[PDB]
């Protein structure tokens, strides 16, 4: 809100290389991040000796800290391509639920509620916008990888180790020694000098 | 689930098993499977599957 008051009074001045729109978005994205102390209320509610959700996360079995924060404290800002929700509903409106040129952070994907508390209808729509990207990119992680995998293999499959530990294409050197050390990648150990 | 045999219906053109459980044919060891078997150096497995089990034959060249 303080950034919005500076915007309304014309007190926001971008640095060289940024427009006022970009600097304002940079200020809003940085201002809407959860602090480290968000875990004080979370860890005050839980018993680490007995809480199974915390033990699965803390030991590394499953889950992360942002998963517990999302469930228990709040989801925060929805970011798509490192940006807030773009006004896509008729020139300055993000949804039919918010006015045009709305200034509040909720209008641009800031989810204030957690999953335990439940999301309102606009928060669920912004959550579905972010979650649809995961489904789209998972489908693309198969097809787009296959295109790059098949072209990489056909360009490299003729590289074969010969009796000098060199890598060549039927006679023609690609490497004077494989990996420049002549070793197998399965036979390495990290050692400090 | 599917398991077939060492024998069954084959394609008249390629001589390879028919496709899938519906045709009572075989299963595909595709292009990526041969990449993995080649990366492992398992060439006798490739002869067993791609030649002895798919459509391997004898060719005569002058």
């Amino acid at each position: 809100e303080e950034i919005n008051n500076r915007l309304l009074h014309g007190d926001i001045m971008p640095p060289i290389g940024l427009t006022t729109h970009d600097f304002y978005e940079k200020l809003q994205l940085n201002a809407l991040k959860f602090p480290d102390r968000i875990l004080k209320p979370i860890m005050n509610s839980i018993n680490p000796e007995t809480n199974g959700l915390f033990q699965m996360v803390a030991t590394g079995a499953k889950g992360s800290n942002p998963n517990m924060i999302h469930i228990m404290a709040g989801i925060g800002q929805i970011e798509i391509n490192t940006q807030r929700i773009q006004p896509q509903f008729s020139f300055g409106r993000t949804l039919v639920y918010y006015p045009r040129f709305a200034l509040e952070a909720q209008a641009y994907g800031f989810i204030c509620n957690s999953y335990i508390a439940g999301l309102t209808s606009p928060e669920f729509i912004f959550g579905e916008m972010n979650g649809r990207f995961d489904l789209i990119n998972k489908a693309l992680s198969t097809s787009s990888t296959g295109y790059a995998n098949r072209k990489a293999i056909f360009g490299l499959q003729s590289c074969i180790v010969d009796y000098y530990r060199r890598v060549s294409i039927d006679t023609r050197l690609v490497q004077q020694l494989y990996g420049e050390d002549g070793l197998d990648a399965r036979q390495l150990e990290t050692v400090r000098f | 689930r599917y398991a077939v045999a060492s024998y069954g219906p084959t394609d008249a053109l390629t001589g390879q098993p028919l496709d899938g459980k519906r045709s009572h044919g075989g299963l595909r060891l595709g292009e990526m499977e041969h990449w993995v078997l080649t990366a492992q150096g398992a060439m006798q497995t490739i002869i067993e599957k791609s030649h002895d089990d798919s459509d391997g034959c004898i060719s005569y060249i002058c």
Partner: protein, 242 residues
């Protein structure tokens, strides 16, 4: 230095430009465009303030009138003389006049470039081009003139990075108080020509730029570095990048 290295073309300081078929009028009796006839008022001040900047004899019947975006001149901190001097240095076959760099809103700053006869002697290899097509091309090359920064780079930030160094006692220490310039866009040769940049330690992310200027062995190290960046933290062994 990062703000010094930022490509500002003359085109991006312009609100609008008008191509006028006019010659030079030392007096108030020659013909001008009606909408811009009032420009002659600050022309007389320009003559009375530039005794050695007099209009030559070979001025053509071609004028390009320019309207500067005062917000961009303020946000980018670009003076009027920096624009004028940059244009006069790069375009010797033109005559340039301008109004005052006034501080009052609603009074615009006008750039007027009169072409010279030598501008219409150059284009001979394409004999099927009239003066209108030549003058338009001159307008295009005037707009693309570099006012500040090196060509090819949009933004130049300032980043903090850590590097190692050997002390006088032989100890290797990681120094964290080092500031770099990570740019947006690649021009190894342009960054190389700058005296504020170390030329021996230019790290471009472009393989083609590295290949052209440095060679195939440096481009080999560049392919290794750029695949590593994409791979991330679970990236493969180094011998697969090799």
């Amino acid at each position: 230095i990062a703000n010094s290295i930022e490509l500002i073309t003359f085109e991006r300081l312009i609100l609008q430009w008008h191509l006028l078929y006019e010659t030079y009028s030392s007096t108030k009796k020659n013909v001008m465009y009606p909408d811009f006839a009032s420009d002659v008022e600050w022309m007389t001040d320009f003559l009375e303030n530039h005794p050695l900047l007099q209009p030559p004899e070979d001025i053509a019947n071609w004028c390009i009138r320019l309207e500067l975006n005062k917000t961009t001149m303020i946000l980018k901190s670009i003076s009027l003389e920096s624009i004028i001097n940059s244009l006069r240095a790069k375009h010797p076959n033109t005559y340039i006049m301008h109004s005052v760099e006034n501080t009052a809103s609603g009074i615009p700053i006008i750039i007027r470039i009169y072409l010279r006869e030598s501008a219409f002697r150059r284009s001979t290899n394409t004999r099927m081009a009239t003066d209108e097509k030549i003058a338009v091309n001159v307008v295009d090359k005037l707009l693309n003139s570099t006012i500040r920064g090196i060509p090819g780079i949009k933004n130049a930030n300032v980043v903090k990075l850590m590097r190692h160094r050997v002390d006088a006692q032989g100890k290797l220490v990681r120094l964290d108080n080092i500031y770099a310039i990570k740019t947006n866009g690649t021009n190894i040769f342009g960054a190389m020509l700058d005296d504020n940049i170390d030329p021996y330690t230019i790290v471009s992310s472009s393989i083609g730029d590295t290949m052209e200027l440095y060679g195939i062995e440096a481009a080999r190290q560049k392919i290794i570095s750029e695949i590593r960046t994409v791979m991330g933290d679970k990236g493969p062994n180094h011998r697969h990048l090799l």
